Amino acid sequence: THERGVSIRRQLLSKKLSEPSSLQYLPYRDYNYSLVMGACCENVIGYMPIPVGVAGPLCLDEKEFQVPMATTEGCLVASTNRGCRAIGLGGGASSRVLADGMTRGPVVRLPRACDSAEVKAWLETSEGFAVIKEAFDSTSRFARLQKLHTSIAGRNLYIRFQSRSGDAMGMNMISKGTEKALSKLHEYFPEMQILAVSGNYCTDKKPAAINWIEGRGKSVVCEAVIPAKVVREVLKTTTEAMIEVNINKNLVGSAMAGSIGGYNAHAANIVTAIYIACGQDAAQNVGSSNCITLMEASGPTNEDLYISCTMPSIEIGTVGGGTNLLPQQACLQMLGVQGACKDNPGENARQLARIVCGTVMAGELSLMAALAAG
Amino acid sequence: ERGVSIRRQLLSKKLSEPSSLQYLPYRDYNYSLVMGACCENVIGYMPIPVGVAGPLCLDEKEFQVPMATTEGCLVASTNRGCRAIGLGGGASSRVLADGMTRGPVVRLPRACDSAEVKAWLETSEGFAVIKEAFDSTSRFARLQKLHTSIAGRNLYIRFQSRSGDAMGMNMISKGTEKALSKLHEYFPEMQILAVSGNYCTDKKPAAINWIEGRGKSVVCEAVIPAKVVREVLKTTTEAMIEVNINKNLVGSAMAGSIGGYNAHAANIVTAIYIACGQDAAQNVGSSNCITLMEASGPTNEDLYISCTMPSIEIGTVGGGTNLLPQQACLQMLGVQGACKDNPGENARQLARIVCGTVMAGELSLMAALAAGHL
Amino acid sequence: LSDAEIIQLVNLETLIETHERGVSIRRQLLSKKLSEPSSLQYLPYRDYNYSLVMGACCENVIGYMPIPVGVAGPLCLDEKEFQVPMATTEGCLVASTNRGCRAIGLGGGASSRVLADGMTRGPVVRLPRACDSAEVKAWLETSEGFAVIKEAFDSTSRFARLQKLHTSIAGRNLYIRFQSRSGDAMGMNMISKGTEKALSKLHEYFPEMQILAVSGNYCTDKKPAAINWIEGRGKSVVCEAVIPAKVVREVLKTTTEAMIEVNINKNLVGSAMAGSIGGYNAHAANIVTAIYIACGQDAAQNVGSSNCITLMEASGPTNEDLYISCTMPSIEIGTVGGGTNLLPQQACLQMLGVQGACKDNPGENARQLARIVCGTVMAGELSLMAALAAGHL
Amino acid sequence: LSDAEIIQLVNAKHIPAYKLETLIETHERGVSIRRQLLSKKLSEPSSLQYLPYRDYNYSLVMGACCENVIGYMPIPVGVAGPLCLDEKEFQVPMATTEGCLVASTNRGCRAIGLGGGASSRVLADGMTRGPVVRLPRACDSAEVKAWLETSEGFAVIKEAFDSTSRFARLQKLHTSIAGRNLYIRFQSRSGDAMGMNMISKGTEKALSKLHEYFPEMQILAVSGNYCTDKKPAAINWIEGRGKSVVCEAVIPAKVVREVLKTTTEAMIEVNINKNLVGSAMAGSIGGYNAHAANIVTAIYIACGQDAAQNVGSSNCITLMEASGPTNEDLYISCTMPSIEIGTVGGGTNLLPQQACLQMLGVQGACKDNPGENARQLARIVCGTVMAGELSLMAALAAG
Ligand SMILES: CC(C)n1c(/C=C/[C@@H](O)C[C@@H](O)CC(=O)O)c(-c2ccc(F)cc2)c2ccccc21
Ligand SMILES: CC(C)n1c(/C=C/[C@@H](O)C[C@@H](O)CC(=O)O)c(-c2ccc(F)cc2)c2ccccc21
Ligand SMILES: CC(C)n1c(/C=C/[C@@H](O)C[C@@H](O)CC(=O)O)c(-c2ccc(F)cc2)c2ccccc21
Ligand SMILES: CC(C)n1c(/C=C/[C@@H](O)C[C@@H](O)CC(=O)O)c(-c2ccc(F)cc2)c2ccccc21
Ligand SMILES: Nc1ncnc2c1ncn2[C@@H]1O[C@H](COP(=O)(O)OP(=O)(O)O)[C@@H](O)[C@H]1O
Ligand SMILES: Nc1ncnc2c1ncn2[C@@H]1O[C@H](COP(=O)(O)OP(=O)(O)O)[C@@H](O)[C@H]1O
Ligand SMILES: Nc1ncnc2c1ncn2[C@@H]1O[C@H](COP(=O)(O)OP(=O)(O)O)[C@@H](O)[C@H]1O
């Protein structure tokens, strides 16, 4: 029994604590550890309950979504809910997925820079790419290599592998594919040393200009027009005040702070709340939060508010990892995107990415209105 | 709980799959603590598996670190890093700075006027007046410094202050409002555009946080004996150093990273933050870290490692730390709540634990990448 | 008419005969507006060929500014020896660079490779909605879409060959980065004309599209930008060399170990602490600037052309020798057009054997010059790093 | 006694070509001879034909500005103006080989002049040097950092630093740790000099003093790239380096129409989408402008500044807004936090460059208010950049 195994572990742990009675408030009973153990967590001593609230309906692409948000930050859900209301009263939001492809960026080294330059040229030919793709794609049915971006630093060569991965976030799958392609590359260049399967050129879980500029995972754009009456009555401000704050805070302020990818008010709050509720990798909030929020006067009198959010690097999935646990599957089902999209692999993950971008836009609208109105 | 059950009933009627909520738990949870403080429109809670890594031998003390995660092998890998550190005599850490920030943006009619306000804020009399207004909002709010930046007629003011054992965003924002109200008495022509002009910078990647710090700045170090590198980490000191330089330094530089000179600090920070009731969205800046390794000892075979994190945003009082399950994890570490005798000591100790655990995580993953053990 | 008579008619190159006199009159007129009338006394203007300058390189000309030119070399690069001209007013720069060349020469020379070649222009256009700009982005990503744009782009010149497109969306805005070869010219003018033509063609397919600016800062030209560092701009070059232990000791006055420790902690860790993007070197900008001024390049392009990462490591059977490499992804350079049309700067290009067009292999002179710049930067890095390591200031 | 004899003697493996001047009794002759020696090593011996070398005062250059001199490179100098700034009019010299740069800048000055002029302010002044030192352990480096942050520690360091020059005044110390490494950014005024030499000397003295209190400390490099000098860096953009300046102006609607050939609305739309959004898409730190580097570079070459410093000196954010009764006037401002400039020392010691500094009325030291000539020049650069931004933006907006 897994539940008793966790029980004993807590007893064994209890003796090493200065306050052994602390564990009494950490839950562990009535939980399915079958799905957890050997797949999601080790040395398990219980679980941490995170409150889940709902924001919506989010009117996006002619559909209505009830968005689950796991958070301990007061007013986050209520504020986001107000943004959804403004969007709904304005006829809804529209979104588009611009790119899709998870990456892995290993670093290999050759004896000389002249050699790494030779390897770079070969990878850039249609023939070089084709053989590397064949080796990469042979690891899984969903791993389809789309492109390579190679960069050198002397005798070092950084290779950014970008690939589709069905409805999965893709890290494991893309990593397995990269290992096989690097092995194949080694057969063509025996003098090549594989330094690390990840040379930080992906880039995974670290802020990086490469993710902002080339994208990682899903690149999405969302937009909406909020009528002047709605800006006044629901957001309690004016279109002019919203625009002035957007330019001076999200553009100029972020520029003064030396930000790369942080041209928004609080995309990270929304991304994180949705990620925790839906079994995503919350640590990926680092790059997934990249966003530029733009606002413009619209309509016959420049009284309406046009808003758009562009997020080039949303790392998300509806199969694998934490999405295999039942409570998180319930949240994915709420959105209608749980598991693989059998009819068209990747569609569930793309829909979830659009929902994230649309919810972020609702969050931006609400916070900006509050800052503008005081 | 009855209101929650009813909200769930109403919500289920708007879903494409009315049974979605079946596996989303909600019973046997105390919502009196959540309602009106941590979350709104509550429909239940999301259980995140909690594992333990340790003991972490830090500053002559041993810690059992709780980590909430759904990523397989993260806890086990971190645990291996702790083992290597423990076998090497432990780690040492130091808090270099402490101060949460808020960076509002105000505007004057002309750039010549904003320059005038700036010179004023830089005199001892100007700062004393602002500090008096700022510090009157709370017993624990003490303004340490001001950093101002001009962009034409706009002026960005970065207020930095201690906040006891609280993360401090609320306290600092209140003090900022009072200080600005006071500044407006001296400059009636000044317009307060937004209490946050993204110059803080909160929840967005920013060079200012990396360079000037935000929250707690911490450094930690350890020396791993050659025999431990071989037997516990399964690699050599030379392989570790080569990977650190080419991945964490050169690779991050090729990717255009600001503050991402590490392997996976974000994973550790996020896991600890969720378990301990911190703001997980703050993982964006809190994850900033530079990992350095070098050879030491009699024969240059031992491994010296250090991790420097200039912007850990953390607290042991307020927000999610008011909930019982998260207090249990803080108690496990011996840092729950306020430190009555020396305000801020519990928060500082938690920051040191985070930096030491990150270092354990870096050691383990780097060894795996170096040895080619995936 | 006398000078005093021409002045009263004013209260020039087309009016007066010779150019030197036009400049002389302009100087006399300007003098009146000066609080110190004799300011221009030491600003030379005589014996200079203004015919190549007027209506091409500068306007409202009042003379010329002499910049001292020194020579560093021989630079042993790719089995050839170069005598590098450097225009500078900074003491010890030429001597220091010369020392670096010596170390490289004593070590058997340096090797270099051009990894990429393509100047860029990044305009910004707008559509009524983001859903529309997304459609345009998708259209440009098709083989047929790119085919038509390339056709329009390429028709503007024999040397204009569009290699690729990189598009980025920001709401209803679309930034398009055009990249193309340009023979031996730096290519900004050629690429800008091709861009204009390609955008007109694009407008035929999407009439609702507004061309906001031919340059939307997505190029990026003369501003520090991560896009140039990551995707390159102009010529991307890498050079390397191995300096024998004996040479490090006797010529550079230090040790391989001290050099490596300084490189890692200054060029890597220090630049990381400073929040630098592309500045992982000691002083590439000094060399780039000195060569650019001497060879008629656009000195303002030093901003991105200076991007460089310098790496050092122990080498040889005993790990005693010094391996060094410099990688510069965005060298914006040319041997035809602009300042390279002036005689004194052509003299410096001729010294290097790269002046003008390479009729046999277009672009070869510009590529060779880029390799020389990267090799000279490496010589400069070696020398300054050795000085910092040994403490010889 | 003859060039041919001297050359034969040199070729007899006795003297390197660089120490020619220390043997001949005339600088110009050493140059002439070095050219002849260089000629025989070129694939094309006549290449030096059009590179001038005669009628130039090499006494100021040798041993101070350049070595192995073979001549000089003439850069055309044009004038843009008058630039109406702070109730004064300036005639700005610009050395460039880029067509239309001077004419375009001149058009921007005209628009500014017709609008009543520009206003500017110097917000900060202080050159920096950022050495890197190492302690045995990170716990030791943390200790040095805490010590430097005390009033006593700073006082001791300031005393050693300031003793190098009367113009040197250590304003602050920004330290950052990376494990056992400690980066210390020294910032100080330097009179009218750009200050790199003075600040480096003071840094060396301060580090020697610090080493007396921490003998375990190793000085790795007087410059650890934390200055940061001649490399793009967020620290310069955020904390400033040299002079931080802001300038502004209001261009009347009629002037935007008639002189700039566009509208206020078109200019604002281009500024936001190019200088703000475009630069953000490109991942720029400090490059929120159209072409500040062109103006900075042209002025720097003409005035004897260090042109390689264009890297950080060109940092600039250009902002435009609708202003006036009907929101048709154009308000513009340029903010440059890191202008590295000086009116004494280096290239400013040469006569032709002093002529350009005199044209602006800022040549040499300001006798009655040290640093005032350098500050005035920084304001001129920022105002000229603003004129350049106005003109190019109008051209891009109008098509
Ligand atoms: C409940 C929440 C949406 N939320 C936050 C605060 C949100 C923070 O987490 C992120 C924010 O710091 C990002 C930024 O704007 O830089 C604020 C708020 C923000 C800035 C401020 F100065 C004072 C209060 C706020 C105000 C009204 C309603 C909800 C609010
Ligand atoms: C369980 C975990 C510690 N964890 C991760 C992978 C961890 C990732 O989340 C972060 C990582 O992506 C950061 C980076 O290094 O860029 C890997 C791993 C990492 C990179 C790779 F190519 C293959 C496997 C790994 C290997 C062995 C044991 C644990 C591991
Ligand atoms: C003649 C020159 C090559 N050059 C420079 C100084 C070079 C500077 O322009 C760039 C440098 O500042 C870049 C950097 O290192 O960050 C120095 C020098 C550098 C730092 C120092 F503290 C003192 C002197 C130097 C020393 C010996 C020989 C030539 C030198
Ligand atoms: C003479 C000059 C003022 N100058 C330049 C070109 C200026 C370039 O050096 C810098 C520019 O590239 C910076 C940028 O905006 O990214 C252009 C120009 C600029 C961009 C373009 F697509 C076409 C022409 C231009 C147009 C009219 C008048 C002068 C101009
Ligand atoms: N529609 C789908 N999209 C992606 N993966 C799918 C799908 N259906 C099934 N799978 C399988 O589930 C796995 C995805 O989870 P996992 O292996 O943990 O990798 P990842 O880290 O990408 O989530 C793959 O082994 C794949 O074969
Ligand atoms: N005035 C100078 N002009 C050009 N190069 C110089 C000059 N002084 C020194 N050098 C360069 O520096 C190298 C070092 O010479 P020097 O400083 O005399 O030291 P050492 O002779 O002890 O090696 C020389 O080989 C030369 O390349
Ligand atoms: N205003 C100034 N700013 C910077 N350096 C200055 C200034 N005035 C003088 N100097 C420096 O001091 C040197 C000598 O001038 P100064 O100190 O005034 O003494 P003196 O009495 O010999 O003129 C000059 O060569 C220059 O380097």
* Phi and psi angles of residue D348, each rounded to the nearest 5 degrees, phi first: -75, -5
Residue appearing with tokens 């490499």: C325
Distance, in Å, from the CA atom of A317 to the CA atom of D79, rounded to the nearest integer, reads: 61
Residue in D166, D167, D377 to alter for ligand 7 test, most ligand atoms within 8 A of Cβ: D167
Structural domain range at position A305 = 51-99+218-374
D57 vs chain A: nearest CA distance in angstroms?
Answer: 43
Q: Are residues D236 and D141 in the same domain?
A: yes
β-partners of residue B47 are A49
Best CA proximity match to D359, nearest among C60, A344, B58, A283 = C60
CA atoms within 13 A on the CB side of B367: 25
Backbone angles phi, psi at D168, to 5 degrees: -80, 125
Instruction: Show the CA angle centred on residue B213, arms to residues B209 and B217, nearest 5°.
Output: 135
Catalytic residue among C13, C222, C257, C364: C222
Q: Give me the phi and psi of C81, to 5 degrees please.
A: -120, 130
Resolution value, angstrom units = 2.3
Q: Please give the backbone phi and psi of residue C315, each rounded to the nearest 5 degrees, phi first.
A: -145, 175
Instruction: Please name the residues in contact with D348: beta carbons below 8 A apart, sequence gap of 6 or more.
Output: D303, D304, D305, D342, D354, D357, D363, D364
Contact between D95 and C122 (Cβ < 8 Å) = no
The residue with tokens 């006071």 is: B182
Helix (H, G, I), strand (E, B) or coil at B36: coil
The DSSP 8-state label assigned to residue A16 in this structure reads T
Q: How far apart are CA D288 and CA D275, in angstroms?
A: 5
- Strands (E) in chain B, as ranges, are 42-58, 61-68, 92-102, 105-107, 142-151, 154-162, 191-194, 215-224, 260-261, 289-296, 302-312
List B residues 94-113 in contact with D (Cβ-Cβ < 8 A): 94, 96, 110-112
Q: Which residue among B40, B105, B202 is best mutated to probe the pocket of ligand 1, counting the most ligand atoms within 8 A of its Cβ?
A: B202
CATH of the domain at C164: 3.30.70.420
Three-state SS for D298?
helix
- Which distant-in-sequence residues (6+ apart) come within 8 Å of C336 by Cβ? C183, C184, C185, C356, C357, C365
* One domain, residues D259 and D398: yes
Note whether B39 and A71 are within 8 A (CB). Answer: yes
Q: H or E stretch including B182?
A: helix B169-186
Q: Are residues B247 and B372 in the same domain?
A: yes
Which residue from A239, A348, A244, A253 is spatially nearest to A304, judged by alpha carbons? A239
Query: How far is C-alpha C117 from the chain's CA centre?
Result: 13
C321-331 and C234-243 beta bridge pairing: antiparallel
Answer for the pair B274, B48: CB distance below 8 angstroms, yes or no. yes
Whole-angstrom Cα distance, residue D44 to residue B302?
Answer: 58
- Following CA atoms A112, A117, A123, A127 in sequence, which dihedral angle do they give, to the nearest 10 degrees? -100
Spatial neighbors of D159 by CB under 8 A, at least 6 apart, are D209
For A11, the 3-state DSSP assignment is helix
Name the residue in chain C with its Cα closest to that of A160: C230
For an interface test with A, which of D241, D272, D316 has the most A Cβ atoms less than 10 Å from its Cβ? D272
Considering the domain architecture, whether residues A74 and A223 belong to the same structural domain is answered as yes
The reply to whether C159 and C32 lie within a common domain is: no
For residues D107 and D58, state if they share a domain. Answer: no
Looking at the fold, whether D102 and D138 belong to one and the same domain comes out as no
| Token digits of residue B267 | 């994973």
Q: Which atom of ligand 2 is nearest to the CA of B361?
A: 3
Radius of gyration of chain D (CA): 25
Domain total of chain A: 3
Burial of A284-313, coded b for 16+ CB within 10 Å and e otherwise, reads: bbbbbbbbbbbbbebeeeebbbbbbbbbbb
The DSSP call for residue C173 is: E
Boundary residue ending a domain (C207, C234, C261): C234
User: Terminus-to-terminus CA distance in chain D, angstroms?
Assistant: 64
Q: Which residues of A are catalytic?
A: 73, 205, 281
**Chain C, chain D: beta-carbon pairs less than 8 Å apart:** 402
Same domain assignment for residues C264 and C358:
yes
Contact B285, B206 (CB under 8 A): yes
Helices B74-87 & B265-275 angle (0-180, nearest 10): 100
Cα D239 from Cα B158, distance rounded (Å)? 12
Q: Tell me how crowded residue C14 is: count the other CB atoms within 10 A of its CB.
A: 6
* A84 vs B26: CA distance, rounded Å: 25
Whether residue C376 lies within 8 A of chain D, CB to CB, comes out as: no
Q: From CA A85, how far away is CA A94, in angstroms rounded?
A: 15
Pairing of strands D119-129, A107-109: unpaired
Does the distance separating the beta carbons of D248 and B308 come in below 8 Å?
no
| Tokens linked to B151 | 């962009």
For residue D335, give the H/E element and its range. strand D329-339
CATH number of the structural domain spanning residue A26: 1.10.3270.10
Is A195 in CB contact (< 8 Å) with chain C? no
DSSP state of D90: E
Q: Are A358 and A58 in contact (CB under 8 A)?
A: yes
Q: How many other CB atoms are found less than 10 A from the CB of residue C37? A: 12
Which atom belonging to ligand 2 lies closest to the Cα atom of B267?
9
State the virtual CA torsion across D91, D96, D100, D102 in degrees, nearest 10.
Answer: -10
Last residue of a domain, one of A189, A217, A245: A217
Cα nearest neighbour of A282 on chain B: B270
A92 phi-psi bin (left φ>0, alpha ψ -120 to 50, beta other): left
CA dihedral B225, B226, B230, B236 (to 10 degrees): 120
Is residue A80 located within the same domain as residue A145?
Answer: no
SS3 A278: coil
Q: Do C171 and A221 touch (CB under 8 A)?
A: yes
All residues at 6 or more sequence positions from D212 whose CB lies less than 8 Å from its CB, including other chains: none
Report residue B221 as tokens.
Answer: 């170090």
What's the CA-to-centroid distance between B288 and ligand 2, angstroms?
Answer: 18
Give the DSSP H or E segment for D79: strand D69-85
SS3 D380: helix
Contact call for residues C76 and C96 (beta carbons, < 8 A): no
Alpha-carbon distance of A97 to B305, in angstroms, equals 42
Is D213 found in the same domain as D140? yes
B49 near B339, Cβ under 8 Å? no
CB contact under 8 A, A292 and D280: yes
What's phi and psi for D318, nearest 5 deg?
-105, 125
Last residue of a domain, one of D203, D218, D242: D242
* Partner-chain contact C240 A98, CB within 8 Å: no
Terminal Cα distance for chain A, rounded:
56
Secondary structure (3-state) at C104: helix
Locate A323 and state its tokens: 């999405």
The four Cα atoms C260, C265, C271, C272 give a dihedral, to 10 degrees, of 120
Q: Is D285 in Cβ contact with C303 (below 8 Å)?
A: no
Euclidean distance between CA atoms C297 and C349, whole angstroms: 10
CA of D96 to the centre of ligand 4 (A): 14
B198 and B274 both lie in a single domain: no
Which residues touch D154 (CB under 8 Å, ≥6 apart)? D148, D173
Whether A281 sits inside 8 A of B197 (CB atoms) is no
Ligand 4 binding pocket, CB closer than 6 Å: C 121, 192, 214-215, 217, 219, 221-222; D 98, 100-101, 104, 290-291, 294, 392, 395
Active-site hit among D306, D321, D328, D372: D306
Return d(Cα D285, Cα D167) in angstroms, integer: 32
Residues 6+ apart with CB under 8 A from C252: C99, C103, C243, C259, C382, C383, C386, C390
Pair D100, D108: CB distance under 8 Å: no
Report phi then psi at D37, rounded to 5. Answer: -65, -45
**Residue B161 Cα distances to B100, B181, B213, D69, angstroms:** 6, 18, 12, 57
Same-domain check for residues A83 and A166: no
Q: How far apart are CA C199 and CA C148, in angstroms?
A: 11
CB C50 within 8 A of CB C32: no
A257: left (phi over 0), alpha (psi -120 to 50) or beta: alpha
Please tell me the distance from the alpha carbon of residue D27 to that of residue D48, in angstroms, as a whole number: 18
Residue C90 falls in the annotated catalytic set: yes
Separation CA C224–CA D296 (nearest Å): 15
- CATH number of the structural domain spanning residue C265: 3.90.770.10
- Chains interfacing with C (3 or more CB pairs < 8 Å): A, B, D
Q: Which residues of D are annotated as a binding site for CoA?
A: 104-110, 259-261
d(CA D277, CA D298): 27
CB atoms within 10 A of CB D99: 17
The one-letter code for the residue type at C115 is L
C311: which strand partners?
C325
Contacts of D200 (CB under 8 A, 6+ apart): C393, D129, D222, D223
Distance from CA of D60 to the nearest CA of C (A): 10
For residue B186, what are the contacts with CB-CB under 8 A and spacing of at least 6?
A: B120, B129
